[PDB]
């Protein structure tokens, strides 16, 4: 046994077609896990993640699912266990962002956000509990906006992640009967190819700055004076899902480089 490593373990990672999830999938592979690369949309993109994990010396398979549809979450987990024999780790990076003043939020937008961010993640945890081996790991995605950062016109999303924080604390109670720990990660400002399209929403008069100015401002929000990156989230997920992370259970870790 090599400490911190996941040799002999099997991990499922959702949201592997965007920056953070892709980095989490590759990192769990690098640590020695075989990986089910779950994704929502681009099969070519997901297969690039599979290829990267194989190149590192670990096995991976891409399995698609619409995480809004609970029957598809059931099938995803069944197929994961059928392919690799068992499953030890489930990480959800599933979610969508949303902005708008309360006054303008529609039924459709509420449902768009909660169906994935909150309901989808709840049922990913349910199916992970049902399928996981004893002593496994579940990690869901919250946000620094749930509790630690207050963004005007971001009530819907912030609440979708506030629910996740409460879920994980109580899931840890129920999941203890299979010795499964349950935690959430709550990233701050993380730079990906989608960051620049929404970064104006997170600062007053955001549109009056250039994208580069907004990224620099985001960097200066951490006392370390750098941006957060997908690898920062992956690094913490890797610890939580290791043997050495066991005593962190039922918690939400805000990953913002000290900004809050």
CB of 195 to its own copies, least distance (A): 21
Residue 77 makes contact with its own copies by CB under 8 A: no
Number of residue whose CB is nearest Cl ion:
17
| CB contact set of 206 (below 8 Å; sequence gap of 6+) | 199, 200, 214
Q: Which of residues 64-123 bind Cl ion (CB under 5 A)?
A: 67, 94
138: closest CA among 79, 70, 84, 91? 91
Q: Choosing among its own copies, Cl ion, none, which partner's interface includes residue 17 (Cβ < 5 to 8 Å by kind)?
A: Cl ion
DSSP conformational letter for 132: P
Residue 118 makes contact with its own copies by CB under 8 A: yes
Q: Choosing among its own copies, Cl ion, none, which partner's interface includes residue 146 (Cβ < 5 to 8 Å by kind)?
A: its own copies
Would you call 27 helix, strand, or coil by DSSP? helix
Long-range CB contacts (within 8 A, 24+) of 211-217 = 215/191
Nearer to Cl ion, 94 or 172 (CB): 94
Catalytic-residue membership of 161: yes
For the chain, how many helices (H) and strands (E)?
A: 8, 7
Residue 200 makes contact with its own copies by CB under 8 A: no
Stretch that binds its own copies, among 38-46, 77-85, 149-157, 208-216 (CB under 8 A): 149-157
Q: Cα separation of 157 and 113, whole Å?
A: 7
Place of tokens 């990156």: 229
44 appears as a binding residue in the annotation:
no
Convert residues 222-251 into a mask of x (bound to Cl ion by CB under 5 A) and - (unbound): ------------------------------
Would you call 117 helix, strand, or coil by DSSP? helix
Q: At what angle do helices 155-175 and 121-131 cross, to 10 degrees?
A: 20
- Assess contact for 168 and 182: CB atoms under 8 A: yes
Binding site for its own copies (CB under 8 A): 70, 101-103, 105, 107, 110, 114, 118-119, 122-123, 125-126, 129-130, 145-147, 150-156, 158-167, 169-171, 173-175, 250
Kindly list the catalytic residues: 142-143, 157, 161
Annotated binding site for NADP(+): 15, 18, 20, 40-42, 66-67, 93-95, 157, 161, 190, 192, 194
């Amino acid at each position: 046994y090599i400490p911190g490593r996941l040799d002999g373990k099997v991990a499922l990672v959702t949201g592997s077609g965007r920056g953070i999830g892709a980095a989490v999938a590759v990192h769990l592979g690098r640590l020695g896990a075989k990986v089910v690369v779950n994704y929502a949309n681009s099969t070519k993109d997901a297969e690039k993640v599979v290829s990267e994990i194989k190149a590192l010396g670990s096995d991976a398979i891409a399995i698609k699912a619409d995480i809004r549809q609970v029957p598809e979450i059931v099938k995803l987990f069944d197929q994961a266990v059928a392919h690799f024999g068992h499953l030890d780790i489930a990480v959800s990076n599933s979610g969508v962002v949303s902005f708008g003043h309360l006054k303008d939020v529609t039924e459709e937008e509420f449902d768009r956000v909660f169906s994935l961010n909150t309901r989808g993640q709840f049922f990913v945890a349910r199916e992970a509990y049902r399928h996981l081996t004893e002593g496994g790991r579940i990690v869901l995605t919250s946000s620094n906006t749930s509790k630690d950062f207050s963004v005007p016109k971001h009530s819907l999303y912030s609440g979708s992640k506030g629910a996740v924080d409460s879920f994980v604390r109580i899931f840890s109670k129920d999941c203890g009967d299979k010795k499964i720990t349950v935690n959430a990660v709550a990233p701050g400002g993380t730079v990906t190819d989608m960051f620049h399209e929404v970064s104006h929403h997170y600062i007053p008069n955001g549109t009056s700055y250039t994208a580069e100015q907004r990224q620099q401002m985001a960097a200066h929000a951490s006392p370390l004076h750098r941006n957060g990156w997908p690898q920062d989230v992956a690094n913490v997920v890797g610890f939580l899902v290791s043997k050495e992370g066991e005593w962190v259970n039922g918690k939400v870790l805000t990953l913002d480089g000290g900004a809050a």
